[PDB]
Coordinates of N, CA and C in Angstrom, one line a residue:
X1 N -2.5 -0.5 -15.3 CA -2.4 0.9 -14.8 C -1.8 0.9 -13.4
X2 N -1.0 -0.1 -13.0 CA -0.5 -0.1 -11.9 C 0.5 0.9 -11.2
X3 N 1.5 0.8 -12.6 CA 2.5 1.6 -12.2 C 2.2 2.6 -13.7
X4 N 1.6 3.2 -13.3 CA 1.5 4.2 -14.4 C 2.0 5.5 -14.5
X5 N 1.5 6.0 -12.7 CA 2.0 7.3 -12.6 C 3.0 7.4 -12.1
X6 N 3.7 6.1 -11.9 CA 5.0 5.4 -10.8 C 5.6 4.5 -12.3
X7 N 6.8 4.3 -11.5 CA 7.7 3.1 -12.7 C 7.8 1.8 -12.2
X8 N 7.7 1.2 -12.9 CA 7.4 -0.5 -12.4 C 8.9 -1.1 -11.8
X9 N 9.9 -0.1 -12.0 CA 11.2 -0.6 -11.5 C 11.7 0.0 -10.7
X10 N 10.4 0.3 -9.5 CA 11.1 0.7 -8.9 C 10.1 0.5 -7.6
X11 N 9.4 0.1 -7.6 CA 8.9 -0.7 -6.3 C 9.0 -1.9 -6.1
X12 N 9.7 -2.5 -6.9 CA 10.5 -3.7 -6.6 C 11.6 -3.6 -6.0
X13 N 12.4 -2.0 -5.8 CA 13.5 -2.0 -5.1 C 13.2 -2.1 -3.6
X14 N 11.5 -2.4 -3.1 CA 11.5 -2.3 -1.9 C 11.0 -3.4 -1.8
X15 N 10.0 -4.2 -2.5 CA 9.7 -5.8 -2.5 C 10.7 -6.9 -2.5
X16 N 12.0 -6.3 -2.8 CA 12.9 -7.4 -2.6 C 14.0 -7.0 -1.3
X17 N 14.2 -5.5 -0.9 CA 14.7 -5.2 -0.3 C 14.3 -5.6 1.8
X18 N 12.7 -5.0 1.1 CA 11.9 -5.3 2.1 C 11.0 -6.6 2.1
X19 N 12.0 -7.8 1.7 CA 11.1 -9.2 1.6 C 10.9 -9.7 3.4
X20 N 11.7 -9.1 3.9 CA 12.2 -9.5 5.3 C 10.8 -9.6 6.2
X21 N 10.6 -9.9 6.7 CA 9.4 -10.0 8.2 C 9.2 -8.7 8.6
X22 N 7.7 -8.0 8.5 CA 7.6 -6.6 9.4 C 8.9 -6.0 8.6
X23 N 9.4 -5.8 7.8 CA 10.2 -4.5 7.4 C 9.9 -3.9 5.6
X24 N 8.7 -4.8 5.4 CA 7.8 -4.2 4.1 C 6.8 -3.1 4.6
X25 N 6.4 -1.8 4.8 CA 5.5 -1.4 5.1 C 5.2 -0.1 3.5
X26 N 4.1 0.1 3.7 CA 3.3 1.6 2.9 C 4.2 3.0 3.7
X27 N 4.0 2.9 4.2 CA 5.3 4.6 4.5 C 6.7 4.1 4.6
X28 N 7.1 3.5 3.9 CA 8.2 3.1 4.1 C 8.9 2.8 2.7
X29 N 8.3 2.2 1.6 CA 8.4 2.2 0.1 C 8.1 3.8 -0.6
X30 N 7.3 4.0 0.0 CA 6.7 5.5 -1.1 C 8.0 6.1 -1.3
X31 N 9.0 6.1 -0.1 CA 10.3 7.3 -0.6 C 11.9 6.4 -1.7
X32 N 11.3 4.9 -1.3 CA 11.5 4.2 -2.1 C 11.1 4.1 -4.2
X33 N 9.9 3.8 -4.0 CA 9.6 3.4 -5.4 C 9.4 5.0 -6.3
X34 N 8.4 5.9 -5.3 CA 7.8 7.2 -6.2 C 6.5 7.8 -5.6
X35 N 6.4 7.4 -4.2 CA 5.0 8.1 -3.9 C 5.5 9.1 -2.7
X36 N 6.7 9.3 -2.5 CA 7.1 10.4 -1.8 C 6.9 11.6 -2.4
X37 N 6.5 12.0 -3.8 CA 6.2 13.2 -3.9 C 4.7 13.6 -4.7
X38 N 4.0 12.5 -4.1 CA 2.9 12.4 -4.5 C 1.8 13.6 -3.8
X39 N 0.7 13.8 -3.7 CA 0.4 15.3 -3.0 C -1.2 14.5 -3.0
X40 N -1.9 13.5 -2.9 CA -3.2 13.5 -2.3 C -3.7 13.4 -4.2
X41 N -3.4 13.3 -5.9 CA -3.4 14.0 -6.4 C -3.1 12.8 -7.7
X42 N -2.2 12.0 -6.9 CA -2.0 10.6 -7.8 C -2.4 9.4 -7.7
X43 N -2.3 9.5 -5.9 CA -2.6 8.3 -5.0 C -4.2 6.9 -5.4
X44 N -5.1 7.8 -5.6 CA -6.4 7.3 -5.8 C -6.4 7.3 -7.5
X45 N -5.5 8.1 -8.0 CA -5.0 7.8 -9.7 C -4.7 6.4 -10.1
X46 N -4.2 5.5 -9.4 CA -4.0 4.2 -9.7 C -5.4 3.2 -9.3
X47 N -5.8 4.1 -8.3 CA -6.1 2.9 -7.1 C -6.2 1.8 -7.1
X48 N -4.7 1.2 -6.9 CA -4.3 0.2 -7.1 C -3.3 -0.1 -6.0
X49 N -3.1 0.6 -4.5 CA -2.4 1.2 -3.9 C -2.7 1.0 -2.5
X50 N -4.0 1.6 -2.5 CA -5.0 1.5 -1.1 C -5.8 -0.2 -1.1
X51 N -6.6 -0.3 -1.9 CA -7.4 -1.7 -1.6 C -7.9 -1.4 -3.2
X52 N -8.3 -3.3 -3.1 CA -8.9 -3.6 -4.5 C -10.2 -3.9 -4.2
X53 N -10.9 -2.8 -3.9 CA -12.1 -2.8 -3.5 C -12.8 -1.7 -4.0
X54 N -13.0 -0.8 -3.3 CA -13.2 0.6 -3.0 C -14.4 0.7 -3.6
X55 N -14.9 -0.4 -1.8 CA -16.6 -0.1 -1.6 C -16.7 1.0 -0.5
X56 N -15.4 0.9 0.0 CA -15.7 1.9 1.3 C -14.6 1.5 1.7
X57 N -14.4 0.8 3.0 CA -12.9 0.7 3.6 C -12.1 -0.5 3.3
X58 N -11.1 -0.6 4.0 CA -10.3 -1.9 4.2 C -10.6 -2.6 5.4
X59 N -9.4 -4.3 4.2 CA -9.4 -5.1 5.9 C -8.0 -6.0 5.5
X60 N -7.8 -6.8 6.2 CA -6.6 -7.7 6.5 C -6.8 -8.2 5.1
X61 N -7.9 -8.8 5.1 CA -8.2 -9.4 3.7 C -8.2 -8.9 2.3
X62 N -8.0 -7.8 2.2 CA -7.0 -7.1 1.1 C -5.8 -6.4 1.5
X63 N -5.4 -7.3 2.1 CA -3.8 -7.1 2.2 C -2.6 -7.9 2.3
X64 N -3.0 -8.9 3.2 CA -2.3 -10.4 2.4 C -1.8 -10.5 1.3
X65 N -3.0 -9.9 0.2 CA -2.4 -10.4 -1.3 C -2.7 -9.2 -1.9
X66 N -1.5 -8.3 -1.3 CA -0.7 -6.7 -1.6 C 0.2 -6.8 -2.4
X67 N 1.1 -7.3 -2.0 CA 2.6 -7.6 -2.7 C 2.5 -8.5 -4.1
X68 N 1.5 -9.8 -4.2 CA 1.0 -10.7 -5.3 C 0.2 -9.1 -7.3
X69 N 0.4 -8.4 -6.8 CA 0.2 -7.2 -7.4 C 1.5 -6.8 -8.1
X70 N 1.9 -6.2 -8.1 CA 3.0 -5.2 -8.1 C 3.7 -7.3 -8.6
X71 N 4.5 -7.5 -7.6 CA 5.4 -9.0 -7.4 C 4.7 -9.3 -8.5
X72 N 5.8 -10.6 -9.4 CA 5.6 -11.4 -10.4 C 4.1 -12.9 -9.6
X73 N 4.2 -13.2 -8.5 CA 3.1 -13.9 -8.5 C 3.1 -14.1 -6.9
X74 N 3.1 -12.9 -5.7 CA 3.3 -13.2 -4.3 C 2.9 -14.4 -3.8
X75 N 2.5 -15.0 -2.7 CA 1.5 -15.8 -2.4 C 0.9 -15.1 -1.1
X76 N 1.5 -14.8 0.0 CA 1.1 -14.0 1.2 C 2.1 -13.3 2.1
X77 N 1.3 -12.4 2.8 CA 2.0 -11.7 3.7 C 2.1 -11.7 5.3
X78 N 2.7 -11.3 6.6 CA 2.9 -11.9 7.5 C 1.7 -11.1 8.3
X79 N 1.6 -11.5 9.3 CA 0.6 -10.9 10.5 C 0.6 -9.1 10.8
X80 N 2.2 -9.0 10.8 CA 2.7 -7.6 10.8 C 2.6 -6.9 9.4
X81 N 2.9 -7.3 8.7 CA 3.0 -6.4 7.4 C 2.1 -6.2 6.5
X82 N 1.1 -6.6 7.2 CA -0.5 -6.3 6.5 C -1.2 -5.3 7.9
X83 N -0.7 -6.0 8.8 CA -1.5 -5.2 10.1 C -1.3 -4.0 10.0
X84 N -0.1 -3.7 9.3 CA 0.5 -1.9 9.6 C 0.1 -1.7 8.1
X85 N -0.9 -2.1 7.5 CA -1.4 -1.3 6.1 C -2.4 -0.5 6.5
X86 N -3.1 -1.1 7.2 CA -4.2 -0.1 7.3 C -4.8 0.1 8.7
X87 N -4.0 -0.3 9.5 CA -4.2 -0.5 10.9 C -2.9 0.5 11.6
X88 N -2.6 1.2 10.4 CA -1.0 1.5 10.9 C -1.2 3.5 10.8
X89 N -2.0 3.4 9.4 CA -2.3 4.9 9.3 C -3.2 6.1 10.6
X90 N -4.3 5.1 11.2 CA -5.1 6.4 12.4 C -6.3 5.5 12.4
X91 N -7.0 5.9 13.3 CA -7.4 4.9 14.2 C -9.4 6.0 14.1
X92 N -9.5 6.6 12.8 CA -10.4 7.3 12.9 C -11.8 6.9 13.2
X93 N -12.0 5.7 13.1 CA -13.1 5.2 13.2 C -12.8 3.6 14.1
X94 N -12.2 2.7 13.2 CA -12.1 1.6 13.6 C -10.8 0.8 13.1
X95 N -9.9 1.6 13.0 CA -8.5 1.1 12.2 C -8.7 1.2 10.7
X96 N -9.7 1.4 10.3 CA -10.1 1.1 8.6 C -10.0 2.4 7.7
X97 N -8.9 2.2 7.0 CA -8.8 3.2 5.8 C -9.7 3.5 4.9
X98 N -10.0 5.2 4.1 CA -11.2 5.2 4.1 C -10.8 6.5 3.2
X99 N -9.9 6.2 2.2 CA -9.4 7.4 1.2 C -9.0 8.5 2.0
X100 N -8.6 8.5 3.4 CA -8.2 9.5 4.3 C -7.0 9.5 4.9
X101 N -6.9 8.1 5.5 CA -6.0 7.7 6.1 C -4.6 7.5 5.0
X102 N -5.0 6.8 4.3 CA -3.5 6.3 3.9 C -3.5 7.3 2.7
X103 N -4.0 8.5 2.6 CA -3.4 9.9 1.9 C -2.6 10.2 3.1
X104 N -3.0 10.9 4.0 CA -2.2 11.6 5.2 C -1.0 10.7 5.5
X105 N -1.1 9.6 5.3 CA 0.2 8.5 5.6 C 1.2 9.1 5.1
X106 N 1.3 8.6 3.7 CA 2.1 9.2 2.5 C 2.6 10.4 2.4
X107 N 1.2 11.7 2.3 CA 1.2 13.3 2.1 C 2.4 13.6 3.1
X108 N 1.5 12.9 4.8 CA 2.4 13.3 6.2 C 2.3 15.1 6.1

C-alpha cells in the first residue's frame, strides 16, 4: 500500500532525478511524484510517507532508510537529506514531526 493513492512510477522520477547530495527532499518530490494535490486527506492514507513508526514522532533514524522503501533496495541517506525530513518542516516542539508538521509541509 505504498503507492496506492499515488503511482509507483512516479516517485522514482525524483529518486533518480534527486539521487544527488541534499537535492532529494519531501517538499520537493510531492509536485514531482503526486502529493502536490493532496489536501491533509491522503497523506496519513498510506502512512508510509511520514515515519514507519507512528508511536508519536520522528527521528534521523527513520530516515536514513526513506528512500530503501519506495527504491528497489536503498542502502542510506546523507546527513542533509534526512536532516531536512523532519527537521525541515517547524520547529514546534523539538524539530520532531508529529502528523502536523509534514501535513503543513506538503498542504503549504
Amino acid at each position: 500500500s505504498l503507492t496506492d493513492i499515488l503511482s509507483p512510477s512516479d516517485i522514482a522520477a525524483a529518486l533518480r532525478d534527486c539521487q544527488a547530495p541534499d537535492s532529494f527532499s519531501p517538499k520537493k518530490f510531492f509536485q514531482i511524484s503526486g502529493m502536490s494535490k493532496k489536501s491533509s486527506s491522503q497523506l496519513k492514507e498510506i502512512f508510509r510517507i511520514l515515519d514507519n513508526d507512528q508511536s508519536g514522532f520522528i527521528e534521523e533514524d527513520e530516515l536514513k532508510y526513506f528512500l530503501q522503501r519506495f527504491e528497489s533496495g536503498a542502502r542510506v541517506l546523507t546527513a542533509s537529506e534526512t536532516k531536512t525530513f523532519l527537521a525541515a518542516a517547524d520547529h514546534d516542539g523539538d524539530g520532531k514531526i508529529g502528523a502536523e508538521e509534514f501535513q503543513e509541509m506538503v498542504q503549504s
